């Protein structure tokens, strides 16, 4: 629709890069003009991997208008560390994104535990090395975006967590510099790096960034929990006071790094409540105004507020099939409240929700 000129497909935009625009670093296509990516995140491929199918990726690219998709490969929580076969879905997903003209974020979904250096995540370097080797001479290699650690956090379920401060950021930096260097040996593909407190801290990254090209830093927000703000931190505010996630994004951009909202949801961060649509409006107007790409959480029919698809609810609904079939569209009532809203926001169309009574 109108105002969608920056939301270009990879066939048009080509290799991504960061350019200075208004004294801030922003995502751009090959020709230097700003590019913004909008799309969806899978839930963990070990639980809801059936979304990686032909008709669903066609639906998300054409009917929903997405020019990007994110593949969330958990490692702990029965992901890649214990079932290696989840990696097969990352490959299949890249192949379909290639085919249906979407950039694809390969996400090493650090989560439980929250320290990316934990033993359970020891396969990270080899994982990224393997995938990058497979695709380095492919003509569509530039479609791939690497995301090295979903959410550095204090989560200690399955190993150590991290602190919300410089020590925490230095732990992530320590983890990522080897992998960045090896990935830069294989190509120039964008690398998105998470940061403390469930990637709410791009501002810490701005204060001590990785010395490499095409590195962007994550922000993750859930509109039921992370309140919008218009006052940026005063010049010289120490990191100890930087608690507001929106102001943390403004600080990162104002202090010279680029940002990518690699995961956001319409619920509270505790997974549910809402959806919170007037605040998601304020947040997406903020992202869109500042050319920050975004991926919404998530492509599941699980019965949780952030889930994009209608769940099974005994008295009222059957769960939407994660393959939409040959028509390659999911009908409006097969989308949950969140899914229906996010599809309209990815498309850039007016939000006109169906009456869920009838
Ligand atoms: O249903 C699959 C698993 O879900 C896990 O909860 C997820 C939640 O659904 C997501 O929104 C995100 O918050 O991550 C959560 C935890 O990783 C749940 O913890 C597991 O027990 C389920 O098997």
**Catalytic-residue membership of 151:** yes
**Catalytic-residue membership of 213:** no
- The closest of 309, 315, 263, 276 to 110, measured between CA atoms, is 263
Is the bond preceding 218 in cis, omega lying within 30 degrees of 0?
no
Say which CATH number the domain at 177 has. 3.20.20.80
Task: Report which DSSP code applies to 227.
Answer: -
As a whole number of angstroms, the distance between CA 298 and CA 249 comes to: 22
Pairing assessment for the beta strands 103-108 and 258-265 based on DSSP bridges = unpaired
Half-sphere exposure of 100 (CA within 13 A, CB side): 25
Total domains in the fold of the chain: 1
Q: Which experimental approach was used here?
A: X-ray
Tokens encoding 334: 């097969």
As a whole number of angstroms, the distance between CA 130 and CA 86 comes to: 14
Tokens encoding 219: 């922000």
Atom in ligand 1 nearest the alpha carbon of residue 265: 11
Residues with Cβ < 8 Å from 281, sequence gap 6 or more? none
Closest residue CA from atom 19 of ligand 1 = 77
Atom in ligand 1 nearest the alpha carbon of residue 48: 2
Tokens encoding 30: 């090959």
Q: Which candidate in 50, 92, 151, 213 is catalytic?
A: 151
Q: What's the gap in Å between 218 CA and the centre of ligand 1?
A: 21
As a whole number of angstroms, the distance between CA 147 and CA 108 comes to: 6
Tokens encoding 258: 């680029």
Of 44, 220, 267, the one to substitute when testing ligand 1's pocket (max ligand atoms within 8 A of C-beta) is: 44
Resolution in A, one decimal? 1.9
Q: 102: domain range?
A: 1-358
For 325-354, give one letter per residue: b (16+ CB within 10 A) or e: eeebebeeebbbbbbbbbbbbbbeeeeeee
For 203-227, give one letter per residue: b (16+ CB within 10 A) or e: bbbbbebbeeebbbbbbbbbbbbbe
């Amino acid at each position: 629709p109108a105002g969608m000129q920056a939301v270009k497909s990879p066939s048009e935009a080509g290799a991504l890069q960061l350019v200075e625009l208004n004294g801030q670093l922003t995502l751009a296509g090959e020709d230097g003009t700003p590019v913004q990516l909008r799309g969806m995140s899978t839930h963990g491929l070990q639980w809801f991997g059936e979304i990686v199918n032909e008709n669903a990726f066609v639906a998300l690219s054409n009917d929903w208008g997405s020019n990007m998709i994110r593949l969330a490969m958990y490692i702990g929580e029965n992901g890649y560390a214990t079932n290696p076969e989840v990696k097969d879905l990352v490959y299949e997903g890249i192949e379909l994104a290639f085919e249906h003209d979407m950039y694809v974020i390969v996400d090493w979904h650090v989560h439980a535990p929250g320290d990316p250096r934990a033993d359970v995540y020891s396969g990270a370097y080899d994982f990224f090395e393997e995938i990058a080797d497979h695709y380095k001479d492919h003509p569509k290699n530039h479609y791939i975006i690497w995301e090295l650690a979903n959410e550095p956090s204090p989560n200690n379920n399955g190993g150590p967590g991290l602190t919300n401060d410089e020590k925490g950021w230095e732990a992530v930096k320590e983890y990522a510099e080897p992998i960045v260097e090896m990935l830069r040996e294989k190509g120039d593909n964008m690398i998105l790096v998470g940061n403390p407190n469930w990637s709410q801290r791009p501002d810490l990254s701005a204060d001590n960034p990785i010395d490499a090209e095409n590195i962007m830093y994550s922000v993750h927000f859930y509109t039921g929990s992370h309140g919008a703000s218009h006052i940026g931190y005063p010049e010289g505010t120490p990191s100890s006071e930087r608690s507001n996630v929106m102001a943390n994004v403004r600080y990162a951009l104002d202090n010279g790094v680029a940002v990518f909202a690699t995961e956001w949801g319409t619920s509270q961060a505790n997974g549910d409540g809402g959806p919170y649509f007037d605040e998601a409006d304020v947040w997406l107007n903020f992202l869109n105004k500042h050319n920050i790409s975004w991926a919404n959480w998530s492509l599941t029919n699980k019965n949780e507020i952030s889930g994009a698809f209608t769940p099974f609810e005994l008295g009222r609904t059957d769960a939407t099939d994660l393959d939409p079939g040959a028509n390659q569209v999911w009908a409006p009532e097969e989308l949950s409240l969140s899914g229906e809203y996010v599809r309209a926001r990815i498309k850039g169309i007016e939000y006109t929700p169906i009456d869920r009574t009838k």
